[PDB]
Each structure stands twice: as structure tokens, then as C-alpha cells.
Amino acid sequence: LHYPVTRQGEQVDHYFGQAVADPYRWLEDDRSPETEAWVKAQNAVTQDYLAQIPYRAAIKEKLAASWNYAKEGAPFREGRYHYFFKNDGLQNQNVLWRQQEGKPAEVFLDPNTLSPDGTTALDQLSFSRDGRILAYSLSLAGSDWREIHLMDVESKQPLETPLKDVKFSGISWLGNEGFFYSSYDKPTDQHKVYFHRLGTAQEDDRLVFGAIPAQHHRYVGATVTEDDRFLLISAANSTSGNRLYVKDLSQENAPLLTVQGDLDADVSLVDNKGSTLYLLTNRDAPNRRLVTVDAANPGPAHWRDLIPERQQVLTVHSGSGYLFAEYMVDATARVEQFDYEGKRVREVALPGLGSVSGFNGKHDDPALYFGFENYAQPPTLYRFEPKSGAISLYRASAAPFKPEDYVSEQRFYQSKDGTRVPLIISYRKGLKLDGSNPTILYGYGGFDVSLTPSFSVSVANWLDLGGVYAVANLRGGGEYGQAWHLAGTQQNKQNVFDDFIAAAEYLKAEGYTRTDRLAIRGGSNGGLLVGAVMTQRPDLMRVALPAVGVLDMLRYHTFTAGTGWAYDYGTSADSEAMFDYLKGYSPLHNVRPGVSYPSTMVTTADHNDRVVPAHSFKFAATLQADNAGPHPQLIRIETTPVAKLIEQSADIYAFTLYEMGYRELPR
């Protein structure tokens, strides 16, 4: 196996008088002739290696087939039509359909046509109060930038020229006058809120917040309440914590009032009832609570509990004049229904143990819809009649997978410090705990993100191939509130890696699998997780699959959206203690010459806005130069989409099973 030669530069960075060599610094430029040539060469070696795997084709074909099935989302009324997303199984992007009373359904907006190879994608859609105008954002290529298009809903033709330079933005209508959105320029790290009035040019949009020094923030958002009474402005500099402001829209030129003026807690708007604001917050409540306060004196000291904090994490949706409190019980959902006065109407019986979506609707919606799923249960839709609480099946899944053919169980293990951590293990019924089943252990562990049960075609296909899929709810995530999150941020980040290592040990000890049959996987912060564990414990697994990971913890913040993750990671510039902690686990800086790493398949796109390819490029290069054992250190750089995903999903599984010693499908 001959790796492409990777040139070593002379770059040397210094942190607190300490020197650190970075020979692959030139790879940080993913658009230079050199880097693009290296990328091309690498993909060559990789595809050549995968060519050796006989069953790859069968896996791809199995993946393709099982994916082709009709999908249809929940309907939602706007104006005089009911809209709904559909996919006949062969379409890259879901199509928005529309239908009027008794009349036949028609296509309303098909994103696939907006681009030859379906590159451009539909992100968010927002209808005016009357449903006569639709604003929707499109993401060209694969960047965080957007364009907001404006369509006349009746004729389905463009209303005005699209708004440009929109990013990390919402789209919230003030009646039928216009909408609020966010952008970094006028109308480069000072995000601002602007108001676009229909019938005017974007160059004249009025600045609402973010321009004066006191309002400078990296991220700002704006939302107008359903009844058009209040404008809520959130402002933040990092991924956790935000300030919040309110403006009464029934008054003429009302001033901004401060709901929360510090970044010591997250607080967001749920709805309003008259002049009373309903807010979800973790302020003085690690598991979050729902509070109310009068909009005319909305400070934290006046907030009053509507739904008090409990031992489980709270999330709140509103619809049909009710509030729906979703609680997380060991990563699985439970739902309760309350009225705006805080009185509990009932516990809503869910179809089982998993994840629920929905329960979101307008004040007047006669019925609410919700989806249910888990690792063995493909997405199912239900109709919930609010008043009686009657539930009825709305759309069974057309996916080619029978739930009862699988097992999905929850187990708890203990991490290094004794902490109890949940783990959900899924597989085809009939499996024996003899420790030989090929297994993929997945995790994330960060940014208060909770890994709740989710159905995946690619995963269900791994289960059919005889493999085991295990998802650990590591600290760093939000499964057990802020405490769970914080025990995995900054100088505690090692707790996340220890929890992951312990899950690996549990799976072997319980007979699910063994070291040569274990693969660990993760994406982004999960890519960091894999990179950190494979460098600290190369002896723990057979295959490592770090996707789009943050792997250079010393320079991650000098890049892209990296400037916004300091809350969770801290930066090498904060202090020497933080620099030392980061250098202590930074994957890129912990690869050592002479170590035998497991077979690795680093995945990433050639260009990416959120997590720059440089992380993966440099990590892969470093592994190829340092690895001593006979295991291949490869990198697959992606260069239509679902056809490219299936391709990549097949490449990963083929590589994994092949590296575990298989030369014929496990089953």
C-alpha cells in the first residue's frame, strides 16, 4: 500500500513560549493547486483499496434498493391550501406539494429543478400571515450562506428579486408587511437583524439590531409572535448562552426591553398570550423550565414558573391553544399537555420508546401531527386531536424494514469516574452474545446535543448485514441537562472520551463484540471524539471512522464557524492551562511515530463551511506518515447527492467489514 507522498513544511507555531511544528500547514488551503492535487491522489489510493472488496457492490445495491420508497410529510395549512412534502423515493430533495378542497394535488415547489445536479437545496420556508406570499431560503453548494427567495403563492412566480448575503438566519413575518432576517453586512463578524419590507429593495432594509457597539454579537436571531404582537431578538457569541430582547409591536416606535441581558443562560420564546411572554429557559434550572413574565417588565427577577423544572430535560412546543411539554427519560420521549394557564390536561400516550417530532401548530389548528421513530422503527406519522386527545395513525412508513425483526435495547454502563451512562444497542433478532458480531459504536458528546433514537436506512442495512449498532449518550450532550453538558466542556472534555472508551469496554465485556470486530464512528464533534479515542487508545478498536471532524484543537478557532465554539472547547489562546489541556488531547497533535493505529477511513468534503477540510486533511496526512502497523490509514474526500451518499455509506461499510477480516458478507 503506497500512500501519496505528502510534503512537510517548516511552519512552527508558538503558544506561551512553547513551540509546535505544523508541517502540513499548506493543506489548510483547500483551494490551492497543491492541495487539490493531493486530494485527487488520495482519493485514487482510496478507491483502489476499496476495489479489493468483492461485496461492496452488493452493499451499494442493497442500500440503493432499500432507500427507494415513497415518503410523505405531515400536511400544514397556509391560506386556502394544504401543503405537504413528498418524495417518490427516487428524488434527491423532497418536493413541496399543495392541494385545495376536493381538488387534485399539484406540485408547488420542486427544489430538484432549481439545479441540474440538484446542488442547490431548500432550507427554510416561511409564509406570510395570510399565506399569500412565501419566503424561503436556498443554500447553493454546501455552504452556510443563503438567499431568501420571495414567491407569490397563487401564481407560483417570483414576487421580487432574492435577498442576498443571508446567513445563520431565521425568516419571521410581521403580518403581511415583510419579515425579519439576519445578515453580516448592510443593507464581518457582527451579525445584524434587518427588516425586509415587501415592495422595497434590500439595500433599503431597516437595521433593527446589531450595529452599535453595545449590540455587537456573533449570532442574532429575530422572531415575531404568531399574533404579531411582539418581536423577540436573541443575541449570542457562542453556541450556548444568549441575551434576549423584546419589542412591543402594537405600540408606535416601541423601545427594546431586556428579557435577559447576560449570557449566563439560554432563554427562548415559546409564545405569548396577551402581554404575557412564555419562555423556555435553563436559568436557575439545569433541566430547563417554562416561565411567564409580562412583556412590559420582562427581567429574570420577575419570571414566574409555568412548568417548573423536573428531574428530566424539558422541551416545549405549542399548538392549537395548548403547550406540549416533551420530557427526556434516558434519551427517550414522553409528552404532556398543558393549557396556557399551566394546568395539566393529560399525559399523551406515545406509540413506544423513541423520539417524537411535531406537536407544533398555529393557535387555531383543529388537529396536530407528530412523528414517532427509533432505531428499529422507521418514521411514522400520527394525528392528535387536541381537545379529546385522540390519536390516530396518519401515515405508516413505506420503508422496507419490519420493526419486529430487530432488537433495540437500553443498557447502562459506568465510566472511569463511576458515572452511569446510557447506551442503546440495536441488531437483528437471533444474534448471539459470543463477542464476534461486527459492531459500530457511535457517539457525539458535546454542545448540549442529545442523541435520541433515530431511524436510519444506512443503519438498518448494517443491522441486516448482521452488524450491531450502539449509541452512547456521553457527557457533553444534553441528555441529563446542563450538568451533563458542562461535565464535558472545556477542561472536562476528557470525560467525554473516557465515557466513550468505557462504552467500548462494556460492549466487549457483555459479549456483544470483541476488539477485532469493533469500529467506532462519529461526525464533526463526533469526529473529534473518534480522533481523540483512536490516538489515546489505538488498542481499543479495529476500525476508526472520523467524519468531518475537528481534529486540530490548537487552530480550530482561527477558522470558519470555529470562532463560535469556545463555550464547549475553550481556545489555545485563553491561557496556558487551556493550551496545555487542548494540546493534551488534540488528535492531530497526539498521533505518534511508531504507533500501530486501527484501520482508518477519514471522510470529508473537498470544501466545507462549518468544519474546514484542513482538519481531516492534516490528520490523514499525519496518520499516513506515523502509522507503524499493517492497518491502512485512508481518507475519502467527497467531490447527485443521495446517490453520492449511498456511495459513501457503501464505501464505509465495505471498508469496515473487510478490515474486520470478512471476505463474504456476515450474512
Quickly name the fold that domain 1-69+399-667 has.
Rossmann fold (3.40.50)
Beta bridge partners of 96: 85, 109
| Residue 658 in grid coordinates | 473487510
Three-state SS at 402:
coil
Domain assignments of the chain as residue spans, ordered by start:
1-69+399-667, 70-398
Three-state SS at 9:
coil
Residue 61: partners with Cβ closer than 8 Å, 6 or more residues away: none
8 Å CB contact between 469 and 440: yes
388: region left, alpha or beta (phi > 0 left; psi from -120 to 50 alpha) = alpha
Q: What are phi and psi of 36, to 5 degrees?
A: -70, -25
User: Chain centroid to CA 118: how far?
Assistant: 22
Nearest CA to 550 out of 536, 534, 562 is that of 562
8 Å CB contact between 573 and 557: yes
Three-state SS at 292:
strand
CA 70 to each of CA 67, 93, 99, 244, 642: distance values in angstroms, whole numbers, following the listed order? 9, 12, 18, 42, 15
CA 523 to each of CA 410, 452, 457, 648, 658: distance values in angstroms, whole numbers, following the listed order? 22, 16, 17, 14, 22
How far apart are alpha carbons 270 and 277 in whole angstroms?
8
Give Rg (Cα) of the chain.
25
8 Å CB contact between 499 and 525: no
CA 135 to each of CA 147, 148, 203, 652: distance values in angstroms, whole numbers, following the listed order? 10, 6, 18, 38
Beta bridge partners of 520: 441, 544
| Residue 389 in grid coordinates | 386527545
Three-state SS at 305:
strand
Q: Angle between the 33-50 and 614-626 helix axes, to the nearest 10 degrees?
A: 60
How far apart are alpha carbons 244 and 544 in whole angstroms?
42
8 Å CB contact between 565 and 556: yes
8 Å CB contact between 649 and 603: no
Write out the H or E segment, with its range, that includes residue 470.
strand 468-472
Nearest CA to 660 out of 439, 477, 446 is that of 439
Using CA atoms of 38, 43, 49, 51 in order, give the dihedral in degrees to the nearest 10: -150
User: Chain centroid to CA 320: how far?
Assistant: 28
How far apart are alpha carbons 307 and 445 in whole angstroms?
28
Query: Degrees (nearest 5) of the Cα angle 619, 592, 5?
Result: 50
| Residue 179 in grid coordinates | 419579515
User: H/E/C letters for each residue in 540-593?
Assistant: HCCEEEEECCCCCCCCHHHCCHHHHCHHHHCCCCCCHHHHHHHHHHCHHHHCCC
| Residue 477 in grid coordinates | 450532550
8 Å CB contact between 439 and 507: yes
User: H/E/C letters for each residue in 152-219?
Assistant: ECCCCEEEEEEEEEEECCCCEEECCCEEEEEECCCCCCCCEEEEEECCCCHHHCEEEECCCHHHCCCE
**First-residue to last-residue Cα distance in the chain:** 29
Nearest CA to 316 out of 281, 283, 265 is that of 281
Three-state SS at 392:
strand
DSSP string, 123-158: EEEEE-TTSSEEEEEEE-TTSSEEEEEEEETTTTEE
Report how this structure was experimentally obtained.
X-ray
* Amino acid letter for position 545: L
Place of cell 393557535: 363
| Homologous superfamily in CATH for domain 70-398 | Prolyl oligopeptidase, N-terminal domain (2.130.10.120)
User: Chain centroid to CA 338: how far?
Assistant: 28
Burial 228-260 (b: 16+ CB within 10 A, else e): ebbbbbbbbbbbbbbbbbbbbbeeeeeeebebb
Query: Degrees (nearest 5) of the Cα angle 511, 517, 522?
Result: 105
Write out the H or E segment, with its range, that includes residue 383.
strand 377-385
8 Å CB contact between 156 and 184: no
**Which letter does DSSP use for residue 475 in this model?**
B
| Residue 230 in grid coordinates | 411582539
| Residue 193 in grid coordinates | 437583524
CA 499 to each of CA 443, 578, 624: distance values in angstroms, whole numbers, following the listed order? 10, 21, 28
Three-state SS at 409:
strand
8 Å CB contact between 451 and 532: no
Strand duo 543-547 + 599-605: pairing: parallel
Strand duo 468-472 + 390-395: pairing: unpaired
Nearest CA to 330 out of 425, 408, 412 is that of 412
**Which letter does DSSP use for residue 255 in this model?**
P
How far apart are alpha carbons 527 and 612 in whole angstroms?
12
8 Å CB contact between 93 and 123: no
Beta bridge partners of 420: 414
Query: Degrees (nearest 5) of the Cα angle 378, 382, 383?
Result: 165
How far apart are alpha carbons 456 and 60 in whole angstroms?
15
Give the burial class of 319: count Cβ atoms within 10 A of its Cβ; 0-12 exposed, 13-18 middle, 19 or more buried. Answer: buried
Shared fold status for 1-69+399-667 and 70-398: no
Query: Degrees (nearest 5) of the Cα angle 256, 192, 565?
Result: 110
How far apart are alpha carbons 587 and 592 in whole angstroms?
10
Q: After which residues is the chain broken (C to N over 2.5 A)?
A: 187, 639
| Residue 580 in grid coordinates | 496545555
Strand segments (E) across 37-152: 71-72, 76-78, 81-87, 95-99, 106-109, 121-127, 133-139, 145-152
How far apart are alpha carbons 335 and 576 in whole angstroms?
46
| Residue 27 in grid coordinates | 493543506
**Which letter does DSSP use for residue 539 in this model?**
G
As a 3-state breakdown, the chain gives helix, strand, coil percent values, each rounded to 5, of 25, 35, 40
8 Å CB contact between 390 and 337: no
Q: Strand 355-358's sheet: what is its strand order?
A: 355-358, 368-374, 377-385, 390-395
How far apart are alpha carbons 2 and 511 in whole angstroms?
37
Three-state SS at 411:
strand
Q: How many CB atoms lie within 10 A of CB 584?
A: 14
How far apart are alpha carbons 593 and 580 in whole angstroms?
21
